Each structure stands twice: as C-alpha cells, then as structure tokens.
C-alpha cells in the first residue's frame, strides 16, 4: 500500500519482500516514487534495495557514498528515486502492473532502514504553471512533460533561492531507464549545471514522440558549480548528510515566429529610416588605396578562422547537448536553424548598416571636396566599426573565454597599426600624462581625474580588462570632444554634439547589466540571466550593441 | 562452483537463487566474472539478473537492449560482467567472502537461462607483457594494473584486427563501482575510443593506490568511430546479436629523462654546431623598418589569441580527461608537465635556429654592402618561417579541425601581403598560366606539368588542401630554381645547391607519412599511429619538421 512507511531489520538470514500492484488508466502517467532511509552509520556493511519493474531493475546501497576530488567521502542516509513511468495509449485497458521491492544486506549484526512507496501527484508539469518541489543529491527528481498541438516550442525555466548546493537540470526523450545519476545524467540527451537559474530551450521536431522527460540531479559536491569546500579532518563528512535545495520549475510557451519577423523588420527598418533621414537631408540640400587594400586582406584573413572555430564550437554543442559550452542569456535566447541565440546575432546589424552609412557620407563629402582635411583615418575608424560589428556578433554565436580573446584582438590589431596591479595602474597613469595661465589647470584636471581611475583599478581589481579599457578609452575621448567645444567657444551641426551624450548615457546604463560573464563557472554566469525587454525578443545587451552603434556614429561625425 | 554453467527456466512464480563463496589471499587479486545468456526472443519480458555483493549490487536484463541513433534497436543475448575485486592487505587473513546470484522474471510462460561464474585467471596486468583477450558489446571487461618500485610512468597500448567495432578504452583509479558501461564509461578517469589502435600514457603521480583499472568496452554502434549504418526496414537488428573484437593489450615502461635529456641535447648542439660552421666559416673568410614593426605588431597581436585558445584546449584536455579531443600521435607522444605532447613541441627548436641564423647572415651582408639588391623580402620571409615554426608549435601543443585553419592563416596572410573541383582545378591552371625558339618548350613543358597537377587534384580530390598548396609551391618554386641554374648555365656556393635537392627529397619522404590525420574520426586518426623512431623520442613528424627546416634554409640561401 502506497502512502506508508514500512519498518524493518535486515541481517544476514532475513530478507524482506513486498510486492506493489497499481494501475495506471491510458492518458494518465503515473510515476512510482520509492523512499528509503537506513540509521546505520557504518560503512562496511550498507543495505543493499532493489525495486523490480516488468522491464527494468534498479538497485541502490543505503546510505549512499560519493567519492568527491580530494578523496573526500560522504555518508547520505535519505535516498529516493523514481521508476520508469509505463505509458497507456488509446489501446485501453486497466494495466495491473506490479512492482517488486527487496531490500536485503550482509550485516553481521544488521542494519536498520524504514521504507516509503507513493505514486507522485505531480508527474505531468502544466504549460505557464510553476511548480515548487525539493531535491537532495541523493533525493533525484523528474517530470514528464507532453507538448500541445498549438505550440511547437516551449523554454523550461527553473529559478532557486539559495545558490548552493550545485545541481544539473537534464531532458531526455522517453525511452527508459532514465539518466538520473551524478555519473550518468550528462550521457544523453540536453542538461546544464545551475545554481540559481536555468533556461533550456526545446523544439517539438526533436522529439518523435512529443513528449520528454525534465531530470533534476543535485551534485554532491559544489567545484562543478565554483563553489569552496570546508577542510574536515574526518573523511567521511558526517555533517553533508542534509544537502537539500528547494527549487521552482516553469514552463512557457516559446514565441511564434510573428514577434521573430516584427522584432527583425524592426531592427532593419528603423536603420532603414536613418538611411531615408539622410537621403532627405541630402535631397533638400540638392535644392589611398594602400589602406584599403592592405586592411580587406587583414579583415578578411583574421576573420576566417574564428569563423571556422566558432562555427565548429556551434556544431558540437548542437550534437552534444552539453550547454555550458557557450555563455549565452538563457532566458532572452532565441533559436533559428542551427543558431541557438538569433537576438544577440541580428542585433549587431545596427554596426554594419551605420558604418555603411558613415562610409557613404565620407564618400560624398571627398567627392565634393575634389570637385589637413583628410578622410583616410575617418575610413580606417570606419571600416574598424564594420569588422568589429561582424567579429562581435560571431563571438556571439557561442561566447566562452576562448574567443572573447579573437573579439578584443582585432581592436588591439588596429590600435598597434595607429601607433601585478600596482604596476598596471603605474602604467595607465605614465599613458595618461603622455598622451596629454589656464592650459595647466585643465592638464591637472585631466591628469587628476585619471588618477581616480588609477585608484579604481588598483583597488577594486575588476575581472574584465576589455571593460576597463573602453572605460578609460570613452571617458578621454570624450573629454578631448569636451575639449574641442569650449575653447570654441572660446575662439567666437550642433544637434549631433547635443545627441552624442544622450545615446552615450544610455549606452552606459545597459552596459554595467552584465547579463552574462563567462569569467566564473558557467553556474554563475546564469545566475545574472534577465528576460527579454524588448518587443520581447530582445535584452540589455542587445540594446547595449544599438546604443553603441549610435554613441560611436554621433561621435565619429562630431569626427 | 565456478567453471560450471547452470541452467534454468524464469517464470513469474519461481527465482532462482545461487550463493558463491571464496577467498582472496592478500596480494592477489581475485575478479569473479559473470557469463549469462538467454534465449527468450521476446522483449516485452527480458529476465533479470542481479549479482549482491557485501556492498555492491549490480543488476542488468537479458536480452540487454542497445537504442541506437535513428531509433534502431538492437537485442543482445549473451551477457557478461566482472564484480568489484575486494583487495587485500598485510593485514591478513584467507577473506571467506560471499556474492549472491538472483535471476528472476515474470514472462507469463517464462524464459530459458544459462549461467556460468569463473575467476579471472589473468586480471593483473604485467609489464611488457602481451595478452589477448575478447571483447563484446554486451561482454565488457576490465583488468588491474599495479605500478612497480622503479618505473614511474607506462603507456598502455591496444590494437586490434578489424576496424570495426568501435571501441572505448578507459583508465580509473580503484574506487569499485567501475565503470564498464557505454553511457557511464566516459564519466570518471581518462579514457578514449579507437577502432584498430589505442595508447594511454600513464604516470604513478596522479594514483595515490598505486594501482589503477584499464576498461575495455565495445560500442554498440560504429558511428562514433565513423562507421556506416546497414539500413535494415527491422527495428529489431536481430542481426547485430555476436558483435565481437579480438584485442591484444600492452603496457610498457615509460622512458627515462635520460633519453628526454639526450634528445634534447641531440638538438639543440646539432643546431649549435651549424652556428659553429656559420662561425667557422666567418673566421676563415676573416683571414625599412616600417616592415619590421608591422610585421612584429601583426605577428604578436595574431598569437596571442591562439595561443590562449590552445592553452584553454591543453587545460581542458587535461582536466576532463576526454583524451578523443587532440589529435596527436599516440604512440610516439611524451609528456612534460602540463604539455602531453613534447616531442612535437621541442621539433620546432629547428625552424626557429635556423630562421635566426638566416637573419644573423643577411644581416652580416647587408652590414658588408654598406661598408636591385635588396633583403627585405629576405628579412620577411625570414620572420615568416620564425612565426610559422612557432605557430606551428603551438599548433602541435593539441592538434585539431579548429586551430589548423589557424595554421595555415598566417601563410595565407603572408602571401596577400606579398601581393566544385573542377571550378578549382581551371582556377589553379589559369593561375599557373598567369604566373610565368626555346622559351615556348619551356613554357609548354610547365603548363603541362601544372595541368598534370591540376588533373591529379580533379581526380583524387584530395581531403588536404594545404598538403596540395604547400606540394604546388614547392614544385614550382623548385622549377624556377632549376630555371635559374640551367640559364646561369647557359649564360657561362655550389654545395648548397646540392644539399637542397637531397634534403627537400628527405623532406617529402616523410611528409608523405601522414601518422595522424584529424579530418576523420578520432579513431580513424589512431588507426595511423606509428611508434618512435629516433633516439626513442622523435617520430616521423618531427623528422618531417626538421627536414622542411633545413630544405627551406638551404633554398633561401639559394635565393
Ligand atoms: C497484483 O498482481 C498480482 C499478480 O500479478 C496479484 O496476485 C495481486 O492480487 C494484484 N493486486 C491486487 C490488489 O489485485
Ligand atoms: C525515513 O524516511 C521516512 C519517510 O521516508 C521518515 O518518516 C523517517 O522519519 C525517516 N527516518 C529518518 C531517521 O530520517
Ligand atoms: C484516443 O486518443 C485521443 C488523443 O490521443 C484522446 O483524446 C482520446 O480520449 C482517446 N480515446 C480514448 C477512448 O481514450
Ligand atoms: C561461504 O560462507 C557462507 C556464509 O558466510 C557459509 O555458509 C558457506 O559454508 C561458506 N562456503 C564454504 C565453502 O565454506
Ligand atoms: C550460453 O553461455 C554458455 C557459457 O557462458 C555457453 O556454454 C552456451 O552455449 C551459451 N548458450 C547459447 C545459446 O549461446
Ligand atoms: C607485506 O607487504 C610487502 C609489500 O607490500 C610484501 O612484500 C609482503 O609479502 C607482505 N607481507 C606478508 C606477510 O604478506
């Protein structure tokens, strides 16, 4: 009888058998769920349990022992787990299945345990209602899920409160027995490793059978996650017998593809729009090859293997299912064919389409200036807009530390072509004053307020040196743009220098979101994922690429 | 008693019980092996078979069933498995131990059973010692090595007859269960697929237990190892039921640093005696710089992203164990370190020796001059053979599909800053053609060697476009050399004219004998490996390394 909690003492002599009989009625799933426990504390002789299907036997040793790195062990005493769950369809009939559970071991003295069987309630999750459940390391869960005629694609969304203990969230298609191991969950199938959030997104024509299964295994230990580990003299860690993480899981339906061609016709068109805005403003006024040829070959060159490399990265983690590769934003991601994240890809187009539009502009005004002004360098900034918008978006296919290095390269490449702390920041300040009655008030002011950035970085140490680059690289640019203005004024068109401060201070407030970083585990970069804000299929980073295209056109036609 | 082979009928009423006791006396370890098949064709009731140990439970179905991709079955009827090996210490004492065999079902009629138990006569590896042994899928297996007092570090070493099974061989510490399984093999401890060979290098270090596991496990498809698939209109392959693999399995004691520290001496004073010479030589004799900074500037700013890449690469090669990453050459690769491959790394000495010595000369004559001869072209081809040996180098820390398109980046951005098979073969011609009484002959004698080529790569259609490229320049920059020494001839030192020919014929010797080819699978890439040829520690690679270092060297000091 389910719903009770059977006692007993095994011993060398005596086994204990009990036989469960249940019934399982087409387009109802029920899944078993076996609760066992067992006080003895010696390790020498566990209380070996075996559950019998009319297919599958699964067997476990109470309590329970994880080996973790630096041969710690663990004693967990609660064990659970859940049996393959026998499907009914339209062929009817009333299944009297049965269930057999023997539980037996080969103590000298024997080995208490108390013994729990009960069908689960909650097996099948509902679309848009969240569900609240516990799981232990020795204590895995999962659930079926079965898709609806309408919708084709749903995002699995799981959100915890306290961020340890490690825990991996997996889905498989139904064909039991079911991964929902330590060792044996990551084989098959799509999972990722969480602490606080998770975010899996599922087609319908992966799955023949248009149902699968959502597996939630706890790790026991927590270095897969980044966490620490308390040194114990005693090698069998008595205290980690409780691990317990209460979880949330969620299920909504993944958008149709309307937004996916209203959120693209409005990325095109609003661009399209500046190129209308110019050709009016052109229309009512009607009423160097070394560089080139040098830099297309670079550009071109450089980009081919990142492109090979990333394009490879995308393939594996397509095939393998193992989601902490790539460093996405798990709740704002959108699939198209072989890309897993289209908002973070078509978002960079706002780069090429104002770069063209910069380096159509030029054109016109050296076509007009044949018929030290010079524009070579503006094409160099230019076309250093192009490549950098194209390389990012390909970083973004599948972000990792890996290739972050190849997006900042390509900036260093064309830095170079112009041309531990304590000593960084005494470097960044010699940079300072080099580069640079009331002449030496303002070059102390500059100087002074470089030197605050110099305490910042040697106090506060932050992680993203790419950061803390364009950082110092805005803050002076801006500051020499600042310079140009006033001793104009000084000397006896201007919506543009007006303009370039606005998109510049939105550009910084989505900018410090920090949705994703890849520095920490893959756990933790998810734990900093937010949804869509935008016609909700895009983010904060996305909207940081737009600002930063408009930021840098404003600022390069002041230029 | 074991070597004997009981026989029973399974129904729903009746199990069968078999209770098996024995000892294992101290320094000897004794693996019981488990040998069970079944003759019921039906899958909707396969017996279960559980064996109970003092403290392991280990339970499988017979016929086990295999799912394959494209939702193929296959239905295995003999089974087999090997028990944890309980070990015994100088604490002594004849271990009376016990292990318990339950077969049971509940087939309405039943299912027949044959079942036999045996102790593994050889389960303890020994050194440099062959033995033979037969896999299956359904059949793992698995032995016990233990390290001696003197050696340090093996390499163990599998090859088989036909390809095809693919299989998995893994190395665990001793910590039962083990993990003989195709969905729980890849979880702990190092460990590879292969087809025909396989070789692990091992070192004492990383095995507090001095002793370690070596398990054998065939796939249950070929698709991993780049196999085919008969498609059969039967979900149940019942053809795919005595998949077997004959095996031969050999572990030698890893070299000494002697040999390490007599190669690289070998080396490094050979290239330290051609700087003799090149001394020798001056004494006897005795009695642009935008170029070179962005050269440099490009060089540096270009490898610094690779070599991350690669490094990231070694890290997690070494950290996660899933050795199928690089493709090395097993056989013939050494460790030092964190690199797992040194040989192919210390190779490169030559290339950069060289390539500085060239520099040193011109630099020597362009010193002299000044005291259309110009050594620029000189001084970048010079650079280009320092950066292509390093980043060939670094290419070689963990060789694959991704970082060889960076490879060959840097010689496809040198060659545009010194400026679908048919398609490429008429492209190929027209630029042969365009490159370049008796000049006629001349010129109809190359295009028709050009098409020759052209014709070779139309046909073959090789799988190595760089081999083809490198293979094109060759013979045609070695036919302009042979131009200029006929027309020299005609038009009325010596040695290293010579010299050249002899070398560059070494060098394509051993080119052509591809020991690891990355473009298939991993295993197919083993299935090439090729074991150490000079002094104990190089292999033909490295050779080839050496050979292309003094061949271009030798035609440089041509030009
Ligand atoms: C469950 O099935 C067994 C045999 O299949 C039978 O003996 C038992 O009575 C059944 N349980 C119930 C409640 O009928
Ligand atoms: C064992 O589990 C049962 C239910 O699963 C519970 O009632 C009992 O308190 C547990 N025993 C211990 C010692 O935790
Ligand atoms: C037959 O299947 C359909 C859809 O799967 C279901 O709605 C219907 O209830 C089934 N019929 C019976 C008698 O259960
Ligand atoms: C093996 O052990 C069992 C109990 O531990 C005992 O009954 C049996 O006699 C032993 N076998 C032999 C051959 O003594
Ligand atoms: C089953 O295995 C035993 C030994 O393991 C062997 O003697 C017997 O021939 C096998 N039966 C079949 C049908 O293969
Ligand atoms: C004690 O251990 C050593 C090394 O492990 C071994 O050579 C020796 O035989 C052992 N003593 C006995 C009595 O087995």
Redesign the pocket.
């Known amino acids: 009888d389910f719903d009770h909690?059977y006692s007993g003492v095994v011993n060398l002599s005596t086994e204990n058998i009990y036989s469960f009989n249940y019934t399982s009625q087409p387009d109802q799933v029920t899944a078993v769920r076996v609760?066992?426990?067992s006080?003895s504390e010696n390790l020498n002789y566990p209380v070996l349990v075996v559950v019998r299907q009319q297919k599958e036997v699964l067997s476990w040793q109470v309590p329970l022992l994880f080996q973790g790195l630096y041969q710690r062990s663990y004693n967990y005493?609660?064990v659970?787990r859940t049996l393959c769950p026998s499907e009914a369809t339209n062929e009817t009939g009333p299944l009297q299945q049965l269930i057999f559970v023997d539980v037996a071991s080969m103590a000298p003295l024997g080995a208490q345990y108390?013994?729990?069987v009960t069908k689960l309630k909650h097996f099948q999750l509902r679309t848009n209602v969240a569900f609240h459940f516990t799981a232990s390391p020795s204590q895995p869960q999962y659930f079926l899920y079965k898709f609806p005629k309408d919708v084709d694609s749903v995002i699995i969304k799981v959100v915890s409160e306290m961020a340890y203990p490690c825990s991996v969230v997996s889905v498989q298609n139904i064909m039991c027995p079911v991964y929902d191991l330590d060792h044996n969950v990551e084989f098959n199938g799509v999972y990722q490793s969480m602490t606080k959030k998770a975010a899996i997104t599922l087609q319908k024509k992966d799955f023949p059978g248009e149902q699968f299964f959502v597996v939630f295994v706890i790790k026991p230990e927590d270095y897969a996650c980044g966490g620490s580990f308390f040194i114990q003299e005693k090698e069998n860690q008595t205290w980690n017998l409780q691990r317990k993480k209460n979880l949330e899981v969620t299920i909504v339906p993944s958008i149709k593809e309307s937004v996916y061609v209203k959120s693209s016709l409005f990325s095109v068109f609003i661009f399209l729009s500046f190129y209308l805005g110019c050709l009016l403003v052109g229309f009512v006024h009607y009423l160097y090859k070394i560089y080139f040829w040098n830099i297309i070959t670079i550009a071109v060159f450089y980009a081919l293997p990142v492109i090979q490399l990333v394009i490879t990265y995308q393939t594996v983690v397509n095939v393998t299912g193992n989601q902490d590769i790539c460093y996405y934003n798990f709740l704002c991601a959108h699939p198209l064919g072989v890309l897993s994240a289209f908002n973070n890809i078509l978002s960079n187009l706002g780069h090429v389409l104002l770069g063209f539009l910069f380096l159509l502009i030029v054109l016109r005004r050296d076509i007009l200036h044949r018929r030290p002004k010079h524009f070579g360098l503006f094409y160099a900034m230019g076309i250093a807009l192009m490549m950098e918008g194209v390389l990012s978006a390909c970083y973004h296919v599948c972000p990792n530390y890996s290739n972050f290095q190849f997006d900042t390269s390509f900036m260093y490449m064309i830095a170079g072509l112009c041309m531990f702390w304590v000593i960084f920041s005494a470097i960044h300040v010699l940079a300072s004053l080099a580069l640079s009655m009331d002449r030496m008030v303002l070059l102390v002011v500059g100087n002074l307020v470089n030197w605050s950035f110099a305490l910042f970085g040697l106090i506060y140490r932050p992680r993203d040196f790419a950061s803390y680059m364009l950082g110092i690289f805005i803050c002076n640019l801006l500051l020499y743009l600042a310079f140009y203005i006033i001793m104009k004024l000084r000397s006896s068109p201007l919506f543009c220098i007006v303009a370039t401060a606005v998109m510049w201070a939105a550009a910084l407030y989505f900018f410090f979101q920090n949705l994703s970083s890849w520095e920490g585990t893959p756990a933790e970069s998810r734990e900093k994922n937010r949804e869509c804000i935008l016609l909700d299929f895009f983010d904060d980073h996305d909207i940081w690429h737009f600002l930063s295209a408009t930021a840098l056109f404003f600022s390069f036609l002041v230029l």
């Open positions: 909690v609760y066992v426990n006080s005493q609660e659970s108390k013994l729990l």
